[PDB]
Amino acid sequence: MISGSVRFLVNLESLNGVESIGNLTKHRTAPVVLKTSTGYLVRYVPVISGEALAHAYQASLVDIAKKEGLPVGSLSSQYEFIKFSTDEALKIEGIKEPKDYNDARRFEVEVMLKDVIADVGGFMYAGGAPVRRTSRIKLGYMIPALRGDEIPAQLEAQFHVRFSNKPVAIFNVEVSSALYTFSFELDEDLIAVPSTFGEKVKGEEELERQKAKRVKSAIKALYSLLSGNFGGKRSRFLPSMKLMSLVVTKTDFPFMPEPAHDDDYIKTTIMRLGKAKGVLNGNLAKAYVINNEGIEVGEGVTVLSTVEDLVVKLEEE
Amino acid sequence: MISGSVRFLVNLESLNGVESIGNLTKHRTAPVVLKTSTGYLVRYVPVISGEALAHAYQASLVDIAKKEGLPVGSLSSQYEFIKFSTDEALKIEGIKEPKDYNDARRFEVEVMLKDVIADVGGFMYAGGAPVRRTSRIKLGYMIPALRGDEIPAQLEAQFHVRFSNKPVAIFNVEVSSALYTFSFELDEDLIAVPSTFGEKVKGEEELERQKAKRVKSAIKALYSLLSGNFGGKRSRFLPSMKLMSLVVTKTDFPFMPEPAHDDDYIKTTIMRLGKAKGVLNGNLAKAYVINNEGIEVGEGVTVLSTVEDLVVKLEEE
Amino acid sequence: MISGSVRFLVNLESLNGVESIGNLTKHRTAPVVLKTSTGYLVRYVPVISGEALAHAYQASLVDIAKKEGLPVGSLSSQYEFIKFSTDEALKIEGIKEPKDYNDARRFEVEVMLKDVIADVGGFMYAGGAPVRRTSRIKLGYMIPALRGDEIPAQLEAQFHVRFSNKPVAIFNVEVSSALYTFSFELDEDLIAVPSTFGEKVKGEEELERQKAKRVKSAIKALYSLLSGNFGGKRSRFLPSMKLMSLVVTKTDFPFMPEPAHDDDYIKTTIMRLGKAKGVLNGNLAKAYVINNEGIEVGEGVTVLSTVEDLVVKLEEE
RNA sequence: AUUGAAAGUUCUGUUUCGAAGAAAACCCGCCUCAGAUU
DNA sequence: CGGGTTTTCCT
Prior knowledge:
The structure is cut from a larger assembly and holds 3 copies of chain A. Chain A has 8 helices and 14 strands. The first copy, chain A, is of the alpha+beta class.
């Protein structure tokens, strides 16, 4: 598994939208529970959903897969991740629906040999014999850091006009500025492995041949998420992003680093990693840290400089 | 016995679901009675059921048991905890049904020598001669703390879309933020001990040999629950969790610590533990405390740092 | 005598159940008559029966009696309180049935020297010469407080599923939250004393020797009820309990404190206790109060902190 | 002080044991607060 | 302006 926590600083941003009222376009907001010296309070803060990040990741994965020669589905070749949900998609791609429970494994292998996206990002088919496949990359909402007593975020509305020589043309757009945080998880030990229980079916040899390439592509795809190629309204509201802190852990057992809420979340996660490897009888535990804000790190930890170095190191091992 | 009270802080969460209405996925809610300065009131608040936690605990126990060589049932090798309820499971596993009341102990031992899950988590078989085994781990609903006059919890709905080039695609998801509390109990003095009354039956020597490993594995399995690996919808709604306060008590007599609703529940439970050991003629009483919010603790109390240290200490003693 | 009134606050609870309909398990409910400013009304409210409390008390008594060396019956050693009702129990234990009326005292003493449970909780034998022994501890149904115009209680239904890989598994459970109240009475002056009139029978000397230990054990057994170890479905629906108010009175004459329905029920019972001792020519009247909700108490009343102190004080006197 | 006067249908018992609403999905594609003044 | 929840279980 590869687990990570990342902290970003974003200014003058509008990357996720919600239903509009009047001539105003609104930014997504959510309630958060925060702890101050006086107790616990409830606040409303701008957020960014995780499905936009999932879409960006899967689009980059499609690009890399088509570049490197891996198979890509017909519908997903165009950036429409309906996958194989409805029967219309099955008809377009040309895959017979499963007949019974015993036939499920064949259908899963057939779908899994045509589109890498269905293999990595999971899918669901509903019918007489529904077939499920959980995603191999897990994301979450992007929240500003709940540090201290004051939330380091702000939201406002802005005024815009459309010029016309014959007036008979005014709209408002919400803009936010915050210090976002988020964490991610990716289990590369289950890529290119069937999930439905059953007997062996012809075609798994090709999967075993392509396993290494699929894992390499899946690990490569994370560069988009770690770089900042996500969100909408990028044509006229291009944001100003800057990485601040990053922790990545590679292990052989389940593990979850601390959220990027406290100023000291790198020392704690490394100590916890050592103790967890000791207690769970693991055999591999490595840590990589990127720091640009000069906070406490610890001892005996590899320190990197950019994200390309981290991607290369993750690929090599 | 091992009895514990734990306090968590969760933000932007959807971990337990219930039946859906329209295009809206709903979060579990329950009524709670709360005391304010003006009297008593009834409120509707999001909660998380205990059966999700039980499933997470049993899945982790399956993983550890397979890793350490302890026997695991065939159906329970797959993460499907029907245990030995119906006749189909008995036919699959290959165990003869009990004949009379006198044969109940043999059936319990045979079931108990094949699946550790049936041993630790209890089971039921209904028929001509019913057989019961109560669970050795007990859990409860996860509730936000009912401190003060305002409940520190909030629930809202969010708007999501599925993109398509040929419109002919909209759903809503309920998201919560709360300060959750829950308590648990695990009696390790009865693990690998038959429950049905009767005579001695061949095969108990193997259970006596495996008792130590079974107890060790059961104690290890709590790390998943104390870490935060439970609940659904984790692929796109990965939650942000953080521990705040934990009290764990090891005794030789029945005891129940205070619920984590009042800010002073560590001092009270320690005083009660001392007096209860005095009054019930016990011979062992230990307490461990993890504090990360700076609330009153007391004197002469072991203070830990993480949960791995607690797990190691519980294993060693 | 020892007479008490106790107020509890329970949330997300399912402790007593009744017949099931379909896939729904129901909670016991009863009608109550309540007085409001508009007159008198009838309502349906969840309750907890008294026999569950009696079972919990007797189980704790069995545990303590076995620990302290007092005799315990063969059938009651396993938690099955058939006592000595039917002839099969007599045959299993090995006690001859009474012959005539004059032999009743012999049978009562013989049964009373073998099981402390029969002595404290009473018993009944039906036959040619019926034998009765009234219980020495008296309990009642657990009702929520009937204060004001609104009953502080709520009941709802919850949805649960069982997972399976081959659909062919859905149930509902009723869950309640309320402010319960209950009162109890225990006359320790009749413990280890035969009740059937007759002549002296050999074996009463042993009862006189064991009277002190039997009284001590009977008083100690109240800790379970005052702590909260009762009810079913504790494996997955562990409740969140918290004491709020308790009044316990020790007297030499019959007396009954006020029910815990009004906010002022501690001052009233103390005034009534003083006047009743004045009028009935008593010689002992002590009161103990546990207060955690800041209601009116009075003057010249012993104030405790926990329940263990109360149990110790009851034992010492 | 009345077809009245005298009468406990009373004692003893858990509705218990076990079971993830779970898997898949961008609200997004275009728009100037602009012209005149010590 | 187009688009507004899909199955498989109900002791």
